[PDB]
Amino acid sequence: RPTFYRQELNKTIWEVPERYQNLSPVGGSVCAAFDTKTGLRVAVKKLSRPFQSIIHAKRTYRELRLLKHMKHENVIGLLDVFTPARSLEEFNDVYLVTHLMGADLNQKLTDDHVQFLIYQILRGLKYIHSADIIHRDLKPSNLAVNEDCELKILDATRWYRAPEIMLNWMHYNQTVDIWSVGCIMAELLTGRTLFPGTDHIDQLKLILRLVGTPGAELLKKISSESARNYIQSLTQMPKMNFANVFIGANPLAVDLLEKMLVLDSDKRITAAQALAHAYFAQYHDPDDEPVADPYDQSLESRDLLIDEWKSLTYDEVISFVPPP
Ligand SMILES: CCCCCCCCO[C@@H]1O[C@H](CO)[C@@H](O)[C@H](O)[C@H]1O
Ligand SMILES: CCCCCCCCO[C@@H]1O[C@H](CO)[C@@H](O)[C@H](O)[C@H]1O
Ligand SMILES: CCCCCCCCO[C@@H]1O[C@H](CO)[C@@H](O)[C@H](O)[C@H]1O
Protein backbone atom coordinates (compact mmCIF):
# COMPACT_ATOMS: atom_id res chain seq x y z
CA ARG A 1 0.00 0.00 0.00
CA PRO A 2 1.36 3.47 -0.87
CA THR A 3 1.72 6.21 1.71
CA PHE A 4 -1.15 8.66 1.20
CA TYR A 5 -1.52 12.35 1.94
CA ARG A 6 -4.53 14.55 2.54
CA GLN A 7 -5.20 18.02 1.17
CA GLU A 8 -8.33 20.13 0.68
CA LEU A 9 -9.11 20.55 -3.01
CA ASN A 10 -12.01 21.62 -5.29
CA LYS A 11 -13.71 21.99 -1.88
CA THR A 12 -13.46 18.39 -0.59
CA ILE A 13 -10.61 16.47 1.09
CA TRP A 14 -8.63 14.54 -1.57
CA GLU A 15 -6.49 11.66 -0.22
CA VAL A 16 -3.97 10.37 -2.78
CA PRO A 17 -0.67 8.46 -2.94
CA GLU A 18 2.37 10.71 -2.48
CA ARG A 19 3.63 9.78 -5.94
CA TYR A 20 1.00 12.22 -7.26
CA GLN A 21 2.25 15.73 -6.59
CA ASN A 22 1.02 19.27 -7.13
CA LEU A 23 -2.68 18.63 -7.76
CA SER A 24 -4.44 21.55 -9.40
CA PRO A 25 -8.17 21.74 -10.19
CA VAL A 26 -9.01 21.54 -13.90
CA GLY A 27 -12.72 21.23 -12.98
CA GLY A 28 -17.11 13.97 -10.80
CA SER A 29 -14.08 16.29 -10.71
CA VAL A 30 -10.67 16.31 -12.47
CA CYS A 31 -7.27 17.67 -11.26
CA ALA A 32 -4.02 17.75 -13.20
CA ALA A 33 -1.07 16.29 -11.29
CA PHE A 34 2.49 15.11 -11.83
CA ASP A 35 3.17 11.43 -11.32
CA THR A 36 6.68 11.23 -9.86
CA LYS A 37 6.84 7.43 -10.33
CA THR A 38 6.48 7.60 -14.13
CA GLY A 39 7.38 11.22 -14.90
CA LEU A 40 3.91 11.69 -16.46
CA ARG A 41 1.50 14.61 -16.31
CA VAL A 42 -1.84 12.97 -15.37
CA ALA A 43 -5.51 13.66 -14.79
CA VAL A 44 -6.81 12.42 -11.43
CA LYS A 45 -10.63 12.15 -11.38
CA LYS A 46 -12.29 11.83 -7.94
CA LEU A 47 -15.69 10.33 -8.63
CA SER A 48 -18.57 12.28 -7.10
CA ARG A 49 -20.81 10.41 -4.66
CA PRO A 50 -19.90 7.08 -6.30
CA PHE A 51 -22.16 4.91 -4.09
CA GLN A 52 -24.88 7.38 -3.05
CA SER A 53 -27.56 5.29 -4.76
CA ILE A 54 -28.03 2.17 -6.86
CA ILE A 55 -27.78 4.32 -10.01
CA HIS A 56 -24.59 6.06 -8.87
CA ALA A 57 -23.04 2.71 -7.87
CA LYS A 58 -23.97 0.97 -11.14
CA ARG A 59 -22.50 3.95 -13.08
CA THR A 60 -19.29 3.81 -11.07
CA TYR A 61 -18.86 0.08 -11.70
CA ARG A 62 -19.53 0.52 -15.46
CA GLU A 63 -17.07 3.42 -15.78
CA LEU A 64 -14.29 1.58 -13.95
CA ARG A 65 -14.81 -1.70 -15.83
CA LEU A 66 -14.83 0.05 -19.22
CA LEU A 67 -11.68 2.04 -18.48
CA LYS A 68 -9.93 -1.09 -17.21
CA HIS A 69 -10.78 -2.88 -20.48
CA MET A 70 -9.52 -0.22 -22.88
CA LYS A 71 -5.92 -0.96 -23.78
CA HIS A 72 -5.15 0.73 -27.13
CA GLU A 73 -2.91 3.63 -28.19
CA ASN A 74 -5.84 5.64 -29.60
CA VAL A 75 -8.24 5.11 -26.69
CA ILE A 76 -7.93 6.67 -23.26
CA GLY A 77 -6.83 4.07 -20.73
CA LEU A 78 -6.40 3.73 -17.00
CA LEU A 79 -2.95 4.52 -15.59
CA ASP A 80 -4.09 3.95 -11.98
CA VAL A 81 -7.12 3.55 -9.79
CA PHE A 82 -6.98 3.86 -6.05
CA THR A 83 -8.84 4.31 -2.82
CA PRO A 84 -7.54 5.36 0.59
CA ALA A 85 -9.73 2.58 2.11
CA ARG A 86 -7.81 -0.39 3.58
CA SER A 87 -10.91 -2.61 3.53
CA LEU A 88 -14.37 -2.91 1.99
CA GLU A 89 -15.86 -1.52 5.20
CA GLU A 90 -13.96 1.80 4.78
CA PHE A 91 -14.57 2.06 1.03
CA ASN A 92 -16.29 5.32 0.08
CA ASP A 93 -14.14 7.00 -2.57
CA VAL A 94 -12.66 6.09 -5.94
CA TYR A 95 -10.00 7.97 -7.91
CA LEU A 96 -9.17 7.30 -11.56
CA VAL A 97 -5.86 8.37 -13.15
CA THR A 98 -5.35 8.85 -16.93
CA HIS A 99 -2.88 10.66 -19.21
CA LEU A 100 -3.35 14.42 -18.90
CA MET A 101 -4.39 15.36 -22.38
CA GLY A 102 -3.54 19.02 -22.94
CA ALA A 103 -5.43 19.57 -26.22
CA ASP A 104 -8.42 18.34 -28.25
CA LEU A 105 -9.84 18.74 -31.79
CA ASN A 106 -12.37 21.43 -30.83
CA GLN A 107 -9.51 27.13 -39.35
CA LYS A 108 -8.96 24.16 -41.63
CA LEU A 109 -6.34 21.46 -41.41
CA THR A 110 -4.15 20.28 -44.28
CA ASP A 111 -5.16 17.09 -46.04
CA ASP A 112 -2.06 15.31 -44.74
CA HIS A 113 -3.02 16.16 -41.18
CA VAL A 114 -6.67 15.12 -41.67
CA GLN A 115 -5.40 11.74 -42.93
CA PHE A 116 -3.36 11.29 -39.82
CA LEU A 117 -6.04 12.35 -37.34
CA ILE A 118 -8.89 10.42 -38.91
CA TYR A 119 -6.64 7.35 -39.29
CA GLN A 120 -6.06 7.38 -35.56
CA ILE A 121 -9.76 7.84 -34.72
CA LEU A 122 -10.62 4.90 -36.97
CA ARG A 123 -7.83 2.74 -35.54
CA GLY A 124 -9.23 3.38 -32.05
CA LEU A 125 -12.82 2.83 -33.23
CA LYS A 126 -11.89 -0.51 -34.86
CA TYR A 127 -10.70 -1.60 -31.43
CA ILE A 128 -13.76 -0.25 -29.53
CA HIS A 129 -16.18 -1.80 -32.02
CA SER A 130 -14.38 -5.15 -31.92
CA ALA A 131 -15.27 -5.31 -28.18
CA ASP A 132 -18.93 -4.92 -29.23
CA ILE A 133 -18.98 -1.42 -27.71
CA ILE A 134 -20.56 1.64 -29.38
CA HIS A 135 -19.21 5.00 -28.34
CA ARG A 136 -22.34 6.96 -29.35
CA ASP A 137 -20.95 10.44 -28.59
CA LEU A 138 -17.93 11.00 -30.74
CA LYS A 139 -17.28 14.71 -31.17
CA PRO A 140 -14.19 16.96 -31.31
CA SER A 141 -14.19 17.51 -27.51
CA ASN A 142 -13.93 13.71 -27.02
CA LEU A 143 -10.76 13.55 -29.14
CA ALA A 144 -7.57 14.49 -27.31
CA VAL A 145 -4.26 15.13 -29.03
CA ASN A 146 -0.69 15.63 -27.73
CA GLU A 147 2.17 17.77 -29.16
CA ASP A 148 3.15 14.99 -31.57
CA CYS A 149 -0.47 14.94 -32.82
CA GLU A 150 -1.08 11.51 -31.32
CA LEU A 151 -4.79 11.09 -30.70
CA LYS A 152 -6.93 9.35 -28.07
CA ILE A 153 -10.68 8.85 -28.00
CA LEU A 154 -12.17 9.97 -24.68
CA ASP A 155 -15.28 8.80 -22.82
CA ALA A 156 -24.18 18.66 -25.14
CA THR A 157 -23.99 19.30 -28.88
CA ARG A 158 -26.05 17.31 -31.42
CA TRP A 159 -23.98 18.33 -34.45
CA TYR A 160 -22.19 14.94 -34.72
CA ARG A 161 -25.13 12.61 -33.95
CA ALA A 162 -26.39 10.01 -36.45
CA PRO A 163 -29.92 10.73 -37.70
CA GLU A 164 -31.29 7.46 -36.27
CA ILE A 165 -30.20 8.55 -32.76
CA MET A 166 -31.89 11.90 -33.38
CA LEU A 167 -35.09 9.91 -34.09
CA ASN A 168 -34.79 7.62 -31.01
CA TRP A 169 -34.61 4.60 -33.32
CA MET A 170 -32.78 2.19 -31.06
CA HIS A 171 -31.32 -0.98 -32.61
CA TYR A 172 -28.24 1.25 -33.12
CA ASN A 173 -25.44 -0.16 -35.16
CA GLN A 174 -21.82 0.63 -34.56
CA THR A 175 -21.80 2.83 -37.70
CA VAL A 176 -23.60 5.53 -35.68
CA ASP A 177 -19.95 6.27 -34.73
CA ILE A 178 -18.89 6.31 -38.39
CA TRP A 179 -21.51 9.02 -39.03
CA SER A 180 -19.87 11.05 -36.30
CA VAL A 181 -16.40 10.48 -37.81
CA GLY A 182 -17.68 11.73 -41.16
CA CYS A 183 -18.98 14.90 -39.55
CA ILE A 184 -15.69 15.48 -37.76
CA MET A 185 -13.59 14.80 -40.87
CA ALA A 186 -15.68 17.24 -42.93
CA GLU A 187 -15.16 19.97 -40.36
CA LEU A 188 -11.39 19.40 -40.20
CA LEU A 189 -11.22 19.72 -44.01
CA THR A 190 -13.41 22.83 -44.37
CA GLY A 191 -12.99 24.53 -40.98
CA ARG A 192 -16.82 24.68 -40.77
CA THR A 193 -19.36 22.53 -38.92
CA LEU A 194 -21.01 20.26 -41.47
CA PHE A 195 -24.48 20.19 -39.86
CA PRO A 196 -24.78 23.10 -37.39
CA GLY A 197 -28.41 22.57 -36.39
CA THR A 198 -30.09 25.19 -34.18
CA ASP A 199 -32.43 22.75 -32.48
CA HIS A 200 -33.40 19.10 -32.62
CA ILE A 201 -35.50 19.22 -35.81
CA ASP A 202 -33.22 21.70 -37.57
CA GLN A 203 -30.40 19.15 -37.16
CA LEU A 204 -32.43 16.60 -39.08
CA LYS A 205 -33.40 19.16 -41.71
CA LEU A 206 -29.75 19.99 -42.37
CA ILE A 207 -28.78 16.31 -42.57
CA LEU A 208 -31.48 15.53 -45.13
CA ARG A 209 -30.39 18.52 -47.18
CA LEU A 210 -27.00 16.90 -47.83
CA VAL A 211 -27.80 13.20 -48.08
CA GLY A 212 -31.28 13.37 -49.64
CA THR A 213 -34.55 11.91 -48.37
CA PRO A 214 -34.89 8.14 -47.89
CA GLY A 215 -34.97 5.90 -50.98
CA ALA A 216 -37.19 2.86 -51.44
CA GLU A 217 -34.65 0.35 -50.03
CA LEU A 218 -34.36 2.34 -46.83
CA LEU A 219 -38.13 2.96 -46.56
CA LYS A 220 -38.61 -0.83 -46.75
CA LYS A 221 -36.64 -1.19 -43.52
CA ILE A 222 -38.79 1.19 -41.42
CA SER A 223 -41.12 -0.50 -38.90
CA SER A 224 -42.71 2.72 -37.59
CA GLU A 225 -45.97 3.43 -39.46
CA SER A 226 -45.79 7.11 -38.47
CA ALA A 227 -42.23 7.44 -39.68
CA ARG A 228 -43.17 5.56 -42.86
CA ASN A 229 -46.13 7.87 -43.51
CA TYR A 230 -44.14 11.03 -42.73
CA ILE A 231 -41.37 9.99 -45.10
CA GLN A 232 -43.78 9.24 -47.97
CA SER A 233 -45.51 12.60 -47.35
CA LEU A 234 -42.08 14.22 -48.00
CA THR A 235 -40.98 15.78 -51.29
CA GLN A 236 -38.28 13.52 -52.78
CA MET A 237 -34.83 15.18 -53.15
CA PRO A 238 -31.46 13.95 -54.52
CA LYS A 239 -28.16 13.59 -52.65
CA MET A 240 -25.97 16.65 -53.14
CA ASN A 241 -22.69 16.41 -55.05
CA PHE A 242 -20.12 15.99 -52.24
CA ALA A 243 -17.43 17.28 -54.64
CA ASN A 244 -19.14 20.71 -54.50
CA VAL A 245 -19.57 20.67 -50.71
CA PHE A 246 -15.87 19.94 -50.31
CA ILE A 247 -14.47 21.97 -53.21
CA GLY A 248 -10.73 21.46 -53.74
CA ALA A 249 -10.48 18.48 -51.34
CA ASN A 250 -8.51 15.33 -52.09
CA PRO A 251 -10.80 13.10 -54.22
CA LEU A 252 -10.00 10.18 -51.88
CA ALA A 253 -11.26 12.27 -48.91
CA VAL A 254 -14.49 13.06 -50.73
CA ASP A 255 -14.98 9.37 -51.60
CA LEU A 256 -14.47 8.34 -47.99
CA LEU A 257 -16.93 11.02 -46.81
CA GLU A 258 -19.52 9.72 -49.26
CA LYS A 259 -19.05 6.26 -47.74
CA MET A 260 -19.46 7.49 -44.13
CA LEU A 261 -22.33 9.94 -44.47
CA VAL A 262 -24.98 7.65 -45.88
CA LEU A 263 -28.44 7.86 -44.39
CA ASP A 264 -28.95 4.08 -44.27
CA SER A 265 -26.67 2.86 -41.45
CA ASP A 266 -26.33 -0.61 -43.03
CA LYS A 267 -24.61 1.00 -46.02
CA ARG A 268 -22.04 3.02 -44.12
CA ILE A 269 -18.41 1.92 -44.28
CA THR A 270 -17.12 0.21 -41.11
CA ALA A 271 -14.03 1.28 -39.17
CA ALA A 272 -12.04 -1.70 -40.41
CA GLN A 273 -13.11 -1.09 -44.04
CA ALA A 274 -12.25 2.59 -43.71
CA LEU A 275 -8.72 1.83 -42.50
CA ALA A 276 -8.11 -0.06 -45.77
CA HIS A 277 -9.38 2.88 -47.89
CA ALA A 278 -6.74 4.42 -50.15
CA TYR A 279 -7.01 7.76 -48.27
CA PHE A 280 -4.97 6.20 -45.47
CA ALA A 281 -2.32 4.50 -47.59
CA GLN A 282 0.58 6.32 -45.87
CA TYR A 283 -0.57 5.03 -42.43
CA HIS A 284 -2.45 1.77 -42.83
CA ASP A 285 -0.65 -1.21 -41.37
CA PRO A 286 -2.63 -4.43 -40.86
CA ASP A 287 0.06 -5.80 -38.49
CA ASP A 288 -0.71 -3.02 -36.01
CA GLU A 289 -4.42 -2.26 -35.99
CA PRO A 290 -5.31 -4.51 -33.12
CA VAL A 291 -8.68 -5.70 -31.84
CA ALA A 292 -9.97 -5.95 -28.28
CA ASP A 293 -10.71 -8.77 -25.89
CA PRO A 294 -14.44 -9.48 -25.54
CA TYR A 295 -16.32 -7.16 -23.15
CA ASP A 296 -19.44 -8.37 -21.30
CA GLN A 297 -21.88 -5.47 -20.99
CA SER A 298 -24.48 -7.69 -19.26
CA LEU A 299 -22.51 -7.38 -15.98
CA GLU A 300 -23.74 -3.81 -16.08
CA SER A 301 -27.50 -3.78 -16.62
CA ARG A 302 -28.04 -5.98 -13.54
CA ASP A 303 -30.38 -4.76 -10.79
CA LEU A 304 -28.24 -5.19 -7.67
CA LEU A 305 -28.13 -3.65 -4.20
CA ILE A 306 -25.80 -0.73 -3.38
CA ASP A 307 -23.51 -2.85 -1.26
CA GLU A 308 -23.25 -5.45 -4.02
CA TRP A 309 -22.23 -2.82 -6.63
CA LYS A 310 -19.87 -1.35 -4.05
CA SER A 311 -18.18 -4.69 -3.32
CA LEU A 312 -17.84 -5.52 -7.04
CA THR A 313 -16.30 -2.08 -7.62
CA TYR A 314 -13.91 -2.58 -4.70
CA ASP A 315 -12.81 -5.89 -6.24
CA GLU A 316 -12.07 -4.10 -9.53
CA VAL A 317 -9.92 -1.58 -7.66
CA ILE A 318 -7.93 -4.31 -5.83
CA SER A 319 -7.42 -6.37 -9.00
CA PHE A 320 -6.07 -3.45 -11.07
CA VAL A 321 -2.65 -3.99 -12.60
CA PRO A 322 -0.92 -0.91 -14.11
CA PRO A 323 0.19 -0.82 -17.75
CA PRO A 324 3.85 -0.64 -18.84
C1 LIG B 1 -12.88 5.22 -22.40
C2 LIG B 1 -12.99 4.34 -23.63
C3 LIG B 1 -13.57 5.05 -24.84
C4 LIG B 1 -15.09 5.09 -24.74
C5 LIG B 1 -15.73 3.79 -25.21
C6 LIG B 1 -16.94 3.45 -24.35
C7 LIG B 1 -18.14 4.34 -24.69
C8 LIG B 1 -18.80 4.91 -23.44
O1 LIG B 1 -20.10 4.34 -23.28
C9 LIG B 1 -21.13 5.16 -23.83
O2 LIG B 1 -21.43 6.21 -22.89
C10 LIG B 1 -22.73 6.50 -22.35
C11 LIG B 1 -22.59 6.63 -20.83
O3 LIG B 1 -23.15 7.86 -20.39
C12 LIG B 1 -23.90 5.59 -22.75
O4 LIG B 1 -24.90 6.43 -23.34
C13 LIG B 1 -23.67 4.44 -23.73
O5 LIG B 1 -24.05 3.23 -23.08
C14 LIG B 1 -22.26 4.23 -24.29
O6 LIG B 1 -22.34 4.38 -25.70
C1 LIG C 1 -38.40 9.51 -39.74
C2 LIG C 1 -39.51 10.53 -39.80
C3 LIG C 1 -39.34 11.61 -38.73
C4 LIG C 1 -40.68 12.23 -38.35
C5 LIG C 1 -40.61 13.75 -38.29
C6 LIG C 1 -41.74 14.29 -37.43
C7 LIG C 1 -42.29 15.65 -37.87
C8 LIG C 1 -41.22 16.68 -38.23
O1 LIG C 1 -41.54 17.98 -37.72
C9 LIG C 1 -42.73 18.60 -38.24
O2 LIG C 1 -42.56 18.93 -39.62
C10 LIG C 1 -42.79 20.23 -40.19
C11 LIG C 1 -41.54 20.63 -40.98
O3 LIG C 1 -40.44 20.83 -40.11
C12 LIG C 1 -43.21 21.38 -39.27
O4 LIG C 1 -44.45 21.89 -39.73
C13 LIG C 1 -43.37 21.12 -37.77
O5 LIG C 1 -42.48 21.99 -37.09
C14 LIG C 1 -43.13 19.70 -37.25
O6 LIG C 1 -44.32 19.27 -36.59
C1 LIG D 1 -36.47 11.09 -42.57
C2 LIG D 1 -35.41 10.62 -41.58
C3 LIG D 1 -34.96 9.20 -41.89
C4 LIG D 1 -33.73 8.77 -41.08
C5 LIG D 1 -33.29 7.37 -41.52
C6 LIG D 1 -32.17 6.78 -40.66
C7 LIG D 1 -31.84 5.36 -41.14
C8 LIG D 1 -30.65 4.75 -40.39
O1 LIG D 1 -30.33 3.44 -40.91
C9 LIG D 1 -31.00 2.40 -40.24
O2 LIG D 1 -30.72 2.41 -38.84
C10 LIG D 1 -31.08 1.29 -38.02
C11 LIG D 1 -30.31 1.33 -36.70
O3 LIG D 1 -29.14 0.55 -36.83
C12 LIG D 1 -31.15 -0.06 -38.72
O4 LIG D 1 -31.86 -1.03 -37.95
C13 LIG D 1 -31.50 -0.10 -40.21
O5 LIG D 1 -31.35 -1.35 -40.84
C14 LIG D 1 -31.02 1.09 -41.02
O6 LIG D 1 -31.59 1.22 -42.31
From Swiss-Prot:
Per the Swiss-Prot or TrEMBL record, the active site comprises 155
Where does it live in the cell? Cytoplasm; Nucleus
- How is this protein activated or inhibited? Activated by cell stresses such as DNA damage, heat shock, osmotic shock, anisomycin and sodium arsenite, as well as pro-inflammatory stimuli such as bacterial lipopolysaccharide (LPS) and interleukin-1.
Consequence of substituting residue 61 to H: Lowered kinase activity
Matching entries from SMART domains are given as:
S_TKc
**What PROSITE patterns does UniProt report for this protein, alphabetically?**
MAPK, PROTEIN_KINASE_ATP, PROTEIN_KINASE_DOM
Q: What is this protein called?
A: Mitogen-activated protein kinase 14
Record annotation: effect of changing residue 45 to R = Loss of kinase activity
Q: What does this protein do?
A: Serine/threonine kinase which acts as an essential component of the MAP kinase signal transduction pathway. MAPK14 is one of the four p38 MAPKs which play an important role in the cascades of cellular responses evoked by extracellular stimuli such as pro-inflammatory cytokines or physical stress leading to direct activation of transcription factors. Accordingly, p38 MAPKs phosphorylate a broad range of proteins and it has been estimated that they may have approximately 200 to 300 substrates each.
Q: Transmembrane residues, as ranges? A: none
Which cofactors does this gene product need?
A: Mg(2+)
Example GO CC term: the record gives:
cytosol
Q: Which UniProt keywords apply?
A: Acetylation, Apoptosis, ATP-binding, Cytoplasm, Kinase, Nucleotide-binding, Nucleus, Phosphoprotein, Serine/threonine-protein kinase, Stress response, Transcription, Transcription regulation, Transferase, Ubl conjugation
Chain residues that bind ATP: 45
Q: Where is the Protein kinase domain?
A: 20-280
Organism the protein comes from: Homo sapiens (Human)
Q: Name the Gene Ontology molecular function terms of this record.
A: ATP binding; enzyme binding; MAP kinase activity; MAP kinase kinase activity; mitogen-activated protein kinase p38 binding; NFAT protein binding; protein phosphatase binding; protein serine kinase activity
